Symmetry: D2
Subunit: 115 residues, 4 copies
Amino acid sequence: CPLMVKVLDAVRGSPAINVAVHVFRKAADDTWEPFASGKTSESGELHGLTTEEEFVEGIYKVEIDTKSYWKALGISPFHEHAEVVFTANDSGPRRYTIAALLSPYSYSTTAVVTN
Amino acid sequence: CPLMVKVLDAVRGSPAINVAVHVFRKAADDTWEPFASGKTSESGELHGLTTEEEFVEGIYKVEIDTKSYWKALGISPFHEHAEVVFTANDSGPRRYTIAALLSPYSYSTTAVVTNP
Amino acid sequence: CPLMVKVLDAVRGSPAINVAVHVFRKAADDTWEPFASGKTSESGELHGLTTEEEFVEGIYKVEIDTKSYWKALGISPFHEHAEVVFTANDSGPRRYTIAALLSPYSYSTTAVVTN
Amino acid sequence: CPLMVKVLDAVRGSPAINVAVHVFRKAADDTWEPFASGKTSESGELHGLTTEEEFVEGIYKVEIDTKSYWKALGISPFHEHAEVVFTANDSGPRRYTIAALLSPYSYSTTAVVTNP
């Protein structure tokens, strides 16, 4: 489990469930090559995106479809999406948790990186 | 300003208007002594709390009545209030902005501290 | 497990380990009566603070000793502590996770409340 | 301002000074067209990006070079940048402040949107 995404809802005080998440790797022509995707579970989590062997050093983008989430809840959002862009494994393979906290007009994102 | 408080509403993307703010300073006997109070303006700011002279070294507490703000909008929020507790002017006078960003079940707070 | 506290470090990108956490209940004379305490684990979590039967409706305060944490890391902090004050169980017993994300001059706190 | 960007440093409790910001607008063929750029001032603000006339309806992207900011301070941060993507002026002209609060392994961003 090298990469996990966790999404929380600051309005309802709950996991953000059924949020679409797309993961991309930066290709050698600086285009984003899509890589993995899924929807958050009932606990707001998305596991199983990639494997140790596949998740090589590179620049990755995680795109979280916040706008659809807020629309599904009948709440007007500001952002198209929340994007998180980071270089992976620069000092060795790590386990990455990308956590995002969502409000309609704000979001925060944090990485929890462990050995 | 020696002390300013700024409050934003993360649901609406707006200043949080008419939010009550109470400031306290810790006394020599460790109680909380009322220091100043006010409410946020149309810009979500509260100015004029104190003066450089009055704002001496000490531990201050800023209590933002976030509950009453959300209740007035129909929302039953998680938090009773947002409180920010800090030592001020330990290395000489500084200007403090206390910013809070409010959601029903979350808040964040940040300090910007500048040397005049 | 009616009440859990989770603390993350935004500087290091890690759980906040060995952070002291005190929990209080508001007494009938409006004083804070201390109630439970502990230190966060290696995963930044604190479990086992209270039981279903004990965690009755009331106003609770969770005080997280951020200042000691930052001092232990040799980083100058702004806040004395992060406090979270909330009324519990107003519509029935819930499971409460209090999550805090720490930076030296900022913190955020969110509640994840589930049935 | 039709568009202002404000950046704060959560480690130091200060404005984030000299942070590069690039703004893009999505074209009719779905590419990202350069729109404006600048760097934050001593107050951590960037003004003068656009004008009411130029800032028409569309999807905009604000990319804040947070990596270079942290690297200059000796820190290897998590994020390459902070990017904020949003539809602007969908219901008529509005004033947008995009605020970002930066930590090495975290950032938050908020929009304050006002009607002149």
